[PDB]
């Protein structure tokens, strides 16, 4: 699955912000517009047994340019919430469900 970081007209969102994949699918977050962005999983909203540090970009790493991306494969079933640090207050938050 592919997720865009920022919308064509600079809007501060994940596109799409709600996705469902199957266990073992790869999500590739691609830097699109409205830089900079990053991807952090919410420690409170992840399936028990998921290690957040293993699955997240460090909160301070940022993608500042086109072509930059972040890939992660999720295996545990259930719902994970994620956000973009710089834009958390702007509502750039999303959610994946692994089936
Ligand atoms: Cu962002």
UniProtKB/Swiss-Prot annotation:
UniProt subcellular location: Plastid, Chloroplast thylakoid membrane
Q: Keyword Transferase: yes or no?
A: no
Q: Name one GO molecular function term.
A: copper ion binding
* Binding positions for Cu cation per the UniProt entry: 37, 84, 87, 92
A Gene Ontology term for the protein's cellular component: chloroplast thylakoid membrane
Subcellular location, principal: plastid
Q: According to its UniProt record, which cofactors does this protein need?
A: Cu(2+)
- Record keywords, A-Z: Chloroplast, Copper, Electron transport, Membrane, Metal-binding, Plastid, Thylakoid, Transit peptide, Transport
Write down the membrane topology: Peripheral membrane protein
> Where in this chain does the record put each Plastocyanin-like domain?
1-99
Query: From which residue to which does the signal peptide run?
Result: none
Function according to Swiss-Prot or TrEMBL: Participates in electron transfer between P700 and the cytochrome b6-f complex in photosystem I.
Q: Which family does it belong to?
A: Belongs to the plastocyanin family.
Annotated protein name in UniProt: Plastocyanin, chloroplastic
The species this protein was found in: Silene latifolia subsp. alba (White campion)
């Amino acid at each position: 699955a592919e997720v865009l970081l920022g919308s064509s007209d600079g809007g501060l969102a994940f596109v799409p912000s709600d996705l469902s994949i199957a266990s073992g699918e790869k999500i590739t977050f691609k830097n699109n517009a409205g830089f900079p962005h990053n991807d952090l999983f919410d420690e409170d909203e992840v399936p028990a047994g998921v290690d957040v540090t293993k699955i997240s970009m460090p909160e301070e790493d940022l993608l500042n340019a086109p072509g930059e991306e972040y890939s992660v494969t999720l295996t545990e079933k259930g719902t994970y919430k994620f956000y973009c640090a710089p834009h958390a207050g702007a509502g750039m938050v999303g959610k994946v469900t692994v089936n």
